[PDB]
Design a protein around this ligand. Structure first.
Ligand SMILES: CCC[C@@H](CC[C@H](Cc1ccccc1)NC(=O)[C@@H](NC(=O)N(C)Cc1csc(C(C)C)n1)C(C)C)NC(=O)OCc1cncs1
Ligand code: HEM
Length: 458
């Protein structure tokens, strides 16, 4: 079975019985992919335990699996562990169910609805600047994840559900406290290690009602959503929560609604707050880029003018800065599609069962497509070098019918935060700042030490 790639004539490292290549993950699965790419070329194969995985790096091959063959062969992401009713969450859902969730939820983030969100978000950007000023009035080291997390939770909850939970004025906010415990995947956790390696365990666990997400956290998020939806129905603006009630009056069940809500809560909070922290980390450590960003905001928005939808969009360098951070810190380190039948794509035979894997981290740092791939140089994303960058090599939000539904939301939300912040403050590194930033070898894209900076006024 570990002789799949040999028989197919596909290069790749040599697997150990049972574990496969899993122990090559010890120095992070990102440096695993990079090392394999450099060594094997555009295509290689490996085994997450028994699960065979095919890694692809040729752009057209990527376009085929991501776009052309989505509905026909590559509809689904890897099955990953015991998930319970969260098996209905759009990102985890398969086939027909993903299909009907995708068109139910996709109208969430249209131009019109995105434009209506600005006033709401600008309000939380004002509380954010007020909070950062306190940390600036003292010169106290600030954990970026804390402050930007509270902001992001406030934005997603308000824009998604129409509710103010005032997380920004509330240190011990149940919403933040629970959500950051929601997923804590670790290769060092025998639980996550075991199901990562030996997937035959999973169906046993689903019976036992065991789940990758902690019970206390899903219960809390379940009753919080029950509450918020009960509110909406008792009141006498169409958002994500309203759309899902419309489909209740096939055939969306209550549990399926909470699933979608937990996904949206998690992305809004965790991904948004993380990307903001990496962006600010790179500004602090690149003082002139911070300076140059500060001057666009001034040129476009003079006399501390409030950002609007179109002012955000006119801002080229702020955009350059964000793309450059996503290039260095892609939240999804790999994109994955399960191959659900035998197919030949770009004169290459892929069998049913294999996980087709696109190593975004590696491709974002390939010396082939990027000169000085390892540094922070926003210029590489200029109006001029715009059709240099291949859309299938640079995939921070993925591609095709299963790309990020919240992409323009998160881009707008982050830029609105960045604009408010940078028109008031300056971020400098301290002794408490880890330079260079090392990433955790554990799970998601997170720093090994939390991002800690000082905040100066203007
Ligand atoms: C509530 C939490 C559920 C998780 C679980 C599904 C997810 C797949 C996914 C990732 C990114 C965007 C969309 C879907 N899984 C992961 O996040 C995993 N990480 C990955 O992204 N990988 C697939 C890479 C990876 C890490 S370990 C591994 C195997 C060796 C087991 N593969 C976790 C478990 C570490 N995802 C989720 O809900 O994502 C919502 C988002 C949308 N946009 C940004 S976040
Ligand atoms: C900077 C923040 C974010 C980054 C970097 C990001 C990135 C991604 C990536 C790379 C994918 C997978 C695409 C693929 O497989 O090709 C994805 C999936 C998804 N994302 Fe985003 N995301 C972000 C924030 C959000 C937000 C704010 C939401 C909405 C609240 C969101 C909702 C989704 C959903 C629902 C999916 C799965 C879509 C599907 O399977 O049909 N993410 N995210």
């Amino acid at each position: 079975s570990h002789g799949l790639f040999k028989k197919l004539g596909i290069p790749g490292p040599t697997p150990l019985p049972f574990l496969g290549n899993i122990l090559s993950y010890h120095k992070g699965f990102c440096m695993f992919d990079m090392e394999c790419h450099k060594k094997y070329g555009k295509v290689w194969g490996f085994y997450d335990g028994q699960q065979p995985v095919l890694a692809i790096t040729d752009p057209d091959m990527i376009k085929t699996v991501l776009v052309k063959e989505c509905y026909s062969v590559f509809t689904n992401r890897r099955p990953f562990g015991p998930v319970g009713f969260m098996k209905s969450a759009i990102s985890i859902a398969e086939d027909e169910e993903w299909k009907r969730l995708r068109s139910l939820l996709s109208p969430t983030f249209t131009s019109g609805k995105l434009k209506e969100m600005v006033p709401i978000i600008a309000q939380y950007g004002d509380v954010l600047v007020r909070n950062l000023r306190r940390e600036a009035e003292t010169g106290k080291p600030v954990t970026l994840k804390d402050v930007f997390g509270a902001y992001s939770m406030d934005v997603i909850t308000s824009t998604s559900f129409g509710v103010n939970i005032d997380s920004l004025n509330n240190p011990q906010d149940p919403f933040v406290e629970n959500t950051k415990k929601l997923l804590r995947f670790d290769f060092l956790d025998p639980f996550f290690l075991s199901i990562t390696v030996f997937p035959f365990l999973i169906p046993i666990l689903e019976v036992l009602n065991i789940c990758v997400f902690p019970r206390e956290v899903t219960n809390f998020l379940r009753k919080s959503v029950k509450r918020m939806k009960e509110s909406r129905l008792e009141d006498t603006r169409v958002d994500f929560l309203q759309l899902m009630i419309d489909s209740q009056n096939k055939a969306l069940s209550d549990l399926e609604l909470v699933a979608q809500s937990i996904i949206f809560i998690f992305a809004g909070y965790e991904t948004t707050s993380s990307v903001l922290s990496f962006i600010m980390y790179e500004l602090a450590t690149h003082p002139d880029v911070q300076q140059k960003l500060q001057e666009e905001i001034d040129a476009v928005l003079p006399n501390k003018a409030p950002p609007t939808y179109d002012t955000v969009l006119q801002m080229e360098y702020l955009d350059m800065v964000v793309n450059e951070t996503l290039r260095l810190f892609p939240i999804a380190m790999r994109l994955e599609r399960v191959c659900k039948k035998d197919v030949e794509i770009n004169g290459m035979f892929i069998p049913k069962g294999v996980v087709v894997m696109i190593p975004s981290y590696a491709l974002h740092r390939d010396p082939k497509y990027w000169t000085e791939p390892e540094k922070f140089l926003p210029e590489r994303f200029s109006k001029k070098n715009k059709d240099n960058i291949d859309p299938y090599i640079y995939t921070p939000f993925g591609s095709g019918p299963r790309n990020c539904i919240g992409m323009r939301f998160a881009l707008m939300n982050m830029k609105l935060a960045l604009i408010r912040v940078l028109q008031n403050f300056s971020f400098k590194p301290c002794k408490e700042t880890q330079i260079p930033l090392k990433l955790s070898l554990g799970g998601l894209l997170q720093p090994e030490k939390p991002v800690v900076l000082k905040v100066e006024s203007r």
